Structure to design on (272 residues):
RNA sequence: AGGACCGAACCGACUAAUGUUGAAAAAUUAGCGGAUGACUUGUGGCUGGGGGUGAAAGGCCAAUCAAACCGGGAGAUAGCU
RNA sequence: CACAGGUGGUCAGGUAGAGAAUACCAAGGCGCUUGAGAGAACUCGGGUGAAGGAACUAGGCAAAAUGGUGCCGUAACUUC
RNA sequence: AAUUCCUUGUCGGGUAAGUUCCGACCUGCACGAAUGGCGUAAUGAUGGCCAGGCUGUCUCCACCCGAGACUCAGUGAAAUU
RNA sequence: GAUGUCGGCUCAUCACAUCCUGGGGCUGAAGUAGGUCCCAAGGGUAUGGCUGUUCGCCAUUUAAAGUGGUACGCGAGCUGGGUUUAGAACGUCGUGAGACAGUUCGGUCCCUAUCUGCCGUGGGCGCUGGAGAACUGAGGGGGGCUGCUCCUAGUACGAGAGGACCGGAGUGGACGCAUCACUGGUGUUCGGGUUGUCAUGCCAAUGGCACUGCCCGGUAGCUAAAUGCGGAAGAGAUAAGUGCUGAAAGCAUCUAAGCACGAAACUUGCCCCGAGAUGAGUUCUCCCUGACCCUUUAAGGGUCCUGAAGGAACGUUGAAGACGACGACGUUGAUAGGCCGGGUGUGUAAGCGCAGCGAUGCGUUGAGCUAACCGGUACUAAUGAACCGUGAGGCUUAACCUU
C-alpha cells in the first residue's frame, strides 16, 4: 500500500520522461483575412476559409 | 494446397429438400491475382503472394504501386502469401478463382475475431463468480487469489488475468463446404467463422482431413 | 483488543 | 376502559450494504421497535471522585472511568529497555 | 471545515387520500462552489431475465414476495 | 435437558439421504422443588426445526440504466521512507 | 518496538509412493471380470442430506471421484460458522472473587500499490542512406479427457451360465474456441396501454413528475440456454517389455559387435505469438545524382540552395479502443450526420364523418410513428497549405567489371 524505500530524484525524472507537452506543429493561415488560426477552427475575428463567418 | 482470400458478407441459412436448415457463412471470394512467386533459389522457400479486391489509386503509395506494376496487376486492398506443396506451379499475374474449392468439401477459415476490449477474468477465462451475498465485500467478480505464500513468493508466468480479449488471429477448422458459386464469386461454409461482417477471411482446404 | 484487528 | 391494536410526527437502534486517511472521532441508505405511557421534550435546579447516580452493563459522571479532570508532593521509583 | 450529523416553539393552501402518510402542485425558495469528454476491467446504487426454484449458505443473509376496502368464512388451544 | 463426558446414546417420526429438530426410553458422567420444581393461554426486532408461496441465493451468469474508475483543464492531500 | 490462526469461497501450482484412461510380466490368468508387480504425470479426477467442521456416515452418480508438497498454498483476495475479549445462563469446582479447553445465546475483519512479480497496452532508441510492404522461424505458449450403442459376433473361449481380444462405425458427457443464421434473454435511445397530479387559455390533443410511475411488446448491438468446430491420424526416438542372429563360456544366452519391435510420456505433426533472435535475418518495390567557405584536416564544422519517397499532425470516423495504439476516409470524396427508398417493430395516429343519451364503436386505415439495420444520395462537415523527414549513403579484405 505504501513504499518501503524513498524513490530517488532519478526515478522521479524517468517517470516524467513522458510528461512533456507537444506544441502545435503549425497554424493555418486564412486565405482572405490573413491571420493565423488552428486548423479547422475559425479565426479570432470570425473568419473561416475566407468566408467571414459570424463575428458579432 | 494454396487457399484464397475472401470477405465475410454475413450469415444465412440454406433449406434442403429433406427439411434441414444449414447455417452458412457467405464468403465473397473475388479473383486472386498473383503478385509474386517465391522459390528456393532466391527466397529459400516456395510460396505465392496474392492480392484481391481494389484500392483507391490516390491512396496507393509509390512503393506499393511499383510492386503491383512489376507483376502487371491492379492494386488490391492487401497482400497475402500461401505456401506451395511441392507440386503446385503458378505464374506472376495469374488469376485464381473460387473454382479452386470445387471439390474440397472441407476448409479452414482464418480471420480476426471481434474485439471485446479490456475484459475481466469472468468473461475472458470463465472464472467463477464469488458469492453475491452472505457478507461478500466488494469481491463479487474479482479474480481472488493469484498465487501461494512465501515459498514461491511470486506470481507465475502465464497466470490468467484480465486484459485484452479478441481482436486477434483465430482459425476454425474442418468447416463443410455447402456451395461454390463461380458466377457470383460466393463460397458458403456451414457454421460461423471468426470476425465481423466485411472483415478479411483466409480460406484454405482442411489440413486435418 | 477485541479479537481480530480491531474488533 | 386499556403500561390495548395498526400507523406519521416524536423517541428508539433489530438486520444488511456502503463508508473505515469516511460527508460523519458511530453516520448514510433500505427495512425494523415503541408511539396515552414505567412515554417524550424545553427551561432552571440538586447530588462530586473511594464519592455521586445506576429497571445493574462495572454502565454513566464534558469525545477521558475497575476510581474524572486540573495543579502540586515531583526530577515518585524503574535490579528494566 | 461554507462538515450528508444535532437543535425548542409558532404558521399549516390545492387535487387524490382515513390522514401532519404518499404522489403531483400553489405562495415562496432552490439546482446543493470544479467542470468537459469517453462509454474498458472492477467497485457502488438500481432495472429485466430462458429452464430450474434454496440445489446457495453456518443460517433463505440479501433479494423476491404479501400489501387496500366491503362481504363471506375462520382450527388446535385458552386464564374465555 | 441452556444441565449427558462417553455420544452422532437407542428406537420411532420427518428426508432419496437428518451429528440439528420432534416424540418416547432412563445407564440423571454431573436435574430437583422460592439462589424455587413442573406446567402454562397470550406476548417476543429472542434460540432451534419443518412446510406453502417467492425468487439471480444458487446451477451460471447475460444485458441494460446511473455514480466512480479512464482522458483533458483547474486546484491539490496522506500513511511510509 | 506483531511472521493473522480452523473450515468454506475464489484462484491455483508442483511431486509420483498412479484413482481413471495408455503399455507390459506373472497368475491358484478358460472367457467375462479380477489379483499382484513393472513402465507411464499427457489430460481427466461427483452432486447432495447431517455437522462450523477437515474428516466421517448416509443417498445417488462417474471411466475415475488418487495420495501428498506449496507459512497443515491462498483474509494488503472474500467470508467469520469454529476458536479466543468485554454481556448472560446451565452443569461442575470454590466459603468467595471467580474458574472449566464442559455446554449454551449474543458479539466492529482497516489499508488509494512505491519496488519485485503477473496480465494487458504504448513511448524512446537501436538494427549503419531513407522509406512502404510481404516474409523466413531461433524461441515461447495453447491444445492432449472420456462414456455408451451398433457391426465384427452370440463368433473365439466355455459342460453350462456367460462372453471377448484385434478392427471399424455412430452418438453423447465435461471442457475449449468462434459466431449471432436459427431458438431466446436484454434492449431506461422504438411503439402502445394505463393510474394520480400539474401544465400547455379551454375542448380535443400532448408534455413534465411519480423506480423507465406502473406495465405489454420490441430494432440494432451484446449475449447463452442457442449452433458450428476442435482433442486426432501420421512420423521420429524410446520406457517397462518382447525378440532375431551371436560369442565370451564347443552348450546356453535379447547383447558384449550387429539387427527388429514397443505407451495418452519425449521430439514433431495441429493452433497462436514471434528478428530487441543486439546472433537485431531474408525478399520485392520506391525516393534523393546541388554550390561554396572555414579549420586543431576528419566518419570534422558552417553558409546558401534544395525538402524527395514517406511520415506525422489536423478533420470526418470504425463491428478498433481505458488512454496510446490499430483500421477506413478527407472533394479526383459515401468517412460521419442529415436526407430519400426499403425493412423491422408497435398495432388501425391526428383530423373529420357516421351510430349511440353516454362511456365508446365504426369508416377514412394495417393507419400513424418508427433508434443503432439495409440499399442509395455530396445537402452539412471532412480547406489550399504548413510541419517532420534530405541531397547517393564508413573502413578493411576477397572475388568480379577488366572470367
Amino acid at each position: 500500500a505504501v513504499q518501503q524505500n524513498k524513490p530517488t530524484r532519478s526515478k522521479r525524472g524517468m517517470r516524467r520522461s513522458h510528461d512533456a507537452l507537444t506544441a502545435v506543429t503549425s497554424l493555418s493561415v486564412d486565405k482572405t483575412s490573413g491571420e493565423k488560426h488552428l486548423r479547422h477552427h475559425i479565426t479570432a475575428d470570425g473568419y473561416y476559409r475566407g468566408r467571414k463567418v459570424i463575428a458579432k | 494446397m494454396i487457399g484464397l482470400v475472401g470477405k465475410k458478407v454475413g450469415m444465412t441459412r440454406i433449406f434442403t429438400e429433406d427439411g434441414v436448415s444449414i447455417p452458412v457463412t457467405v464468403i465473397e471470394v473475388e479473383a486472386n491475382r498473383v503478385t509474386q512467386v517465391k522459390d528456393l533459389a532466391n527466397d529459400g522457400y516456395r510460396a505465392i503472394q496474392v492480392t484481391t479486391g481494389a484500392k483507391k489509386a490516390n491512396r496507393v503509395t509509390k512503393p506499393e504501386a511499383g510492386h503491383f506494376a512489376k507483376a502487371g496487376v491492379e492494386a488490391g486492398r492487401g497482400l497475402w502469401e500461401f505456401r506451395l506443396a511441392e507440386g503446385e506451379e503458378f505464374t506472376v499475374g495469374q488469376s485464381i478463382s473460387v473454382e479452386l474449392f470445387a471439390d474440397v468439401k472441407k476448409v479452414d477459415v482464418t480471420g480476426t475475431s471481434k474485439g471485446k476490449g479490456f475484459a475481466g477474468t469472468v468473461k475472458r477465462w470463465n472464472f467463477r463468480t464469488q458469492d453475491a451475498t452472505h457478507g461478500n465485500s466488494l469481491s463479487h467478480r474479482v479474480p481472488g487469489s493469484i498465487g501461494q505464500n512465501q515459498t514461491p513468493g511470486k506470481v507465475f508466468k502465464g497466470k490468467k488475468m484480465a486484459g485484452q480479449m479478441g481482436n486477434e488471429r483465430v482459425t476454425v477448422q474442418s468447416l463443410d463446404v455447402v456451395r461454390v458459386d463461380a458466377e457470383r464469386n460466393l463460397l458458403l461454409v456451414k457454421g460461423a467463422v471468426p470476425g465481423a461482417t466485411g472483415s478479411d477471411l483466409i480460406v484454405k482446404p482442411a489440413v486435418k482431413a | 483488543x477485541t479479537x481480530p484487528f480491531x474488533x
In short: Residues 1-209 of chain B form one domain. The radius of gyration of chain B is 23 Å. Chain B has one domain: 1-209.
